[PDB]
Amino acid sequence: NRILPDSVDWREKGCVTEVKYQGSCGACWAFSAVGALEAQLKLKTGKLVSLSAQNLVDCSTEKYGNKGCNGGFMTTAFQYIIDNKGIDSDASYPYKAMDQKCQYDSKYRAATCSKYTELPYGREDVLKEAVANKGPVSVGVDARHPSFFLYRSGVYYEPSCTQNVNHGVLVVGYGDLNGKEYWLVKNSWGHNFGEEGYIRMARNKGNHCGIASFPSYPEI
Template sequence: MVCSYAVRRLAKKQHGKSYHSTEEEHLRMNIFAHHLKMIEEHNAKFEAGLVTYSLAMNHFGDMLPEEVPQLGFDTTGEMMQEPSFTFLPPANVEIPESIDWRQLGAVTPVKSQGSCGSCWAFSSTGAVEGQLFRKTGKLVSLSEQQLIDCSGSYHNTGCDGGRIYSSFTYLMDAEGLEKEDSYPYEALNGTCRYNKDKVVPGTKLKAYTNIRYRDDDALKAAVATVGPISVGVSANHDHFRFYKGGVFNGDTCKYMIDHAILLVGYGSENGEEYWLVKNSWGAAWGEGGYIRFKRSIKNICSISSMASYPVLQ
């Protein structure tokens, strides 16, 4: 495939791409052009009303799927660990038709994990941030870097991947999490410098709770009555990577769970029910950093296969 000047200009100027050799540039521009064609063809279907979501070019444009660093969810043994509790939907409680924990004040601004496979840390802190808000009424941005640097002995491997339950188990043993400001994000593996005197009061855990496997109704009840929920999904496919907006129907999802994100609500638009999910790829991705998954498809992209939340002390 011979790439046009327009493709090169788009890749270099708008998306900041540069390369070490003409051979690498040729390879990367071919990949970029392939993705651009795929996006344009899909968006033509979107404009015609044939699909419910749109795509857009972004910084993944010149990468092969196996090169995408911004995943990092290690599911090895994730379901083997006995949870502290299993969520039971509350009896005699009416579950609302919609909920958005952003509007209720329980969700911090969208963050970016950069080129570090630390999605698990962002999902974990997001869930703790939500529970802390529900308990204290205060929204505090917590440190993902502390989890990256300090939870290695709990089977997490920093930027090379990690597990949500391992993060929660670490926080059951540690005194809690520091603020983002006092232990800032660096997008790389570092030496643990956690200071127990700087932890945010109330962020130590006494347990964590799993949602029943593949139970969408239980997941809906949990996010409605508990708050933001950590979930794992299948994300390493083109339509997720280049998602721009609308209700994602999961037509390109695989069975492998490879990414951790934060479920912050659900609702419907024009009769289309959706899950509202916060990603950690920055606000330029998706709908201001969020994606909506089609809720009428059971366990879409495995969203209800691996869901949990922390229980504060």
């Protein structure tokens, strides 16, 4: 294992925005993407600003292989931001949990992206390094299991979990709670979900729920 802090929590560094609520629109991928970029924006500019998930839903569309409320990719969302030369703030381009026409306006730009990096498949050591040295990392997890929806506390370990990931989330840290290593994950199902919108998921337990399957992070 690499030399790195035993625990990280980017919330303590003011790099994580409020937990969002995606409602009945499958835009987790867009929440995951903007979450990652939000952290980089704070690191670069000193300002913590929620970015427009809606902008991705409406604008990073077929050209990026995305389907708005019916799914998409965090990496191709980053590419859209690069190509588009920006993304609007959440305040300026609010989230309506539906597919809408692209309404991007550079007058409302709140961040840029120059590149993104996809981490190697399933490597939790590399993910740890990135979370420690780069910032929060966009990942997908297998969130299909009834136990996920009902998670309240502790470290989530579900024997039935798979590496077939279906839900974009954000790794904002990691640590150890009562001898269980975890990844600290920001979800987008509101504050009602889990621990004020967060879930601790099992770390170094065989890429549990595929958390380290498809990690990426952007740079400004």
